[PDB]
Amino acid sequence: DNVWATHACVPTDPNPQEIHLENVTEEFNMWKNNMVEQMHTDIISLWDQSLKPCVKLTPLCVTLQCTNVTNNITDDMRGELKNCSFNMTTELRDKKQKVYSLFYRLDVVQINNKEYRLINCNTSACTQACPKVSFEPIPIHYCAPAGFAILKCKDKKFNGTGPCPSVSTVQCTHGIKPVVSTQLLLNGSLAEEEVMIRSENITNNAKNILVQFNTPVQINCTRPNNNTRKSIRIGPGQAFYATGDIIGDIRQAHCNVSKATWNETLGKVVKQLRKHFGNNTIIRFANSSGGDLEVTTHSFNCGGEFFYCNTSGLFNSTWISNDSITLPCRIKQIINMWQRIGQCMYAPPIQGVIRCVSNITGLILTRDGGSTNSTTETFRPGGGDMRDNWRSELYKYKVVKIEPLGVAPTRCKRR
């Protein structure tokens, strides 16, 4: 109709036409369609294009000396933020300046007051996200060129594999925001009648089972402390934005989900789960068992800041045939996002408090298959692979090529 730069993208048309084909049966496959890989490649290349005209920030990681900042900080998350005092080249290339910055523990490591260095510049130098650009997602409609038609699924009971009785064509896809998530799908497109279960092979535990909600559950993640930003010049025209002194107290970032609505939604999920395994199977939910931070913790963005949430208080229950759950979401700055070696991010701090109100649409669970013909199946959250995040939004689409030639027998003769 920012990072997702549409200044190089053509405008769409108003009221795009849709034709309901009637006597067709199309064999869809959401797990082998090739538009998802093209979407992933386009997002990666366009992200790298949007990272080109910002600050390089390569000379920054001089040996840092960090003390514990401890001012009137609360009891928990003690020794998380650090008060590092390093010195840098200025606009003139014959002077230096001693400065101070605030950094998290998850960005600096000890190299042996004790000296610290950033976690990035053993592998590569991070590139700053220059602050005119925002990370908010905007919808993107995928069209088709001449000769190619996009067929859209319209069966309301559709597990993503097999034939479809009602197929309609369309030239434009709907609003598809490239949302960033790892365990809880945010701001997605909802279901219509029940909660649906999609997978490769439901008797195989090595494939990510994927569920999509019928009604949304509201989530409020916020960061309460009042941080400020200061500009430190590192050369003739390049500025690095460091975290200033915090006004007030220090508190950890909370994340709120309503308890009864989540319990009802989990009841819907466990009711739709047992149609694949049995009517007497005990279903349990345990917390995640990831190795890194991105798989262990629910991760997203909040308009400039990147969150990492414990989410242990949500997936902890067993099911036999105004209170709000709080989550200690935590903040990191150095982002190695698309899992490529030697390219990363420095996200600048956002001045003032930040608030994000979102809603959860899908979950990416993973089965824990002990043995055959058992009576207990435990499910854990997971993900990390970003192709499955956009596979829940491109299931009802496929691309075909028209071949308009054809021959038929008849009675006629050419003269």
Binding site: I119, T123, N205, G290, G291
Partner: protein, 158 residues
């Protein structure tokens, strides 16, 4: 992928140990490179793993005296142990893990394993032998005994 270790076989007591496991024919994308130790009196035991962005995870029994570092330039990663006592003599393997859930994950692509023996003894001769196992020929030859002080002793009789 093939992995190979490199390091000293004799480390003096109360000194910093160092080892290096190299990676050949592969890339460091989306794997948990780990270390493992096989003691003959304590069984198999885990040391720690490192991810390619420096996100480390050490065992809680050995937290504070271990350090694992990754380097993407020379295609290798290294271990460092601090304040090594005499009870850490073992063989040391390096293995990898897949990215994802560790609930069903198993260690694969094992290396050869370089034996590292830690001692606190000195050079002496047998009073009928730390630096050299002595051979006596005149009978039967019998295996040696490691004392608590780190010395050696054997017996031989016709």
């Amino acid at each position: 992928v093939q992995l190979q270790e490199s390091g000293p076989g004799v480390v003096k007591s109360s000194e910093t140990l160092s080892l290096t496991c190299t990676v050949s024919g592969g890339s460091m994308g989306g794997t948990y490179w780990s270390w493992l130790r096989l003691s003959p009196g304590k069984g198999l035991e885990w040391i720690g793993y490192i991810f390619h962005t420096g996100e480390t995870n050490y065992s809680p029994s050995l937290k504070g005296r271990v350090s694992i570092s990754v380097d993407t330039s020379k295609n290798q990663f290294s271990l460092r142990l601090r304040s090594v006592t005499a009870a850490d003599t073992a063989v040391y393997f390096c293995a990898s893990l897949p990215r994802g859930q560790l609930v069903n994950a198993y260690f694969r692509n094992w290396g050869r394993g370089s034996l590292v023996s830690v001692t606190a003894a000195s050079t002496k001769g047998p009073s009928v032998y730390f630096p050299e196992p002595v051979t006596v020929s005149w009978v039967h030859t019998f295996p040696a005994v490691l004392q608590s002080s780190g010395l050696y002793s054997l017996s031989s009789v016709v």
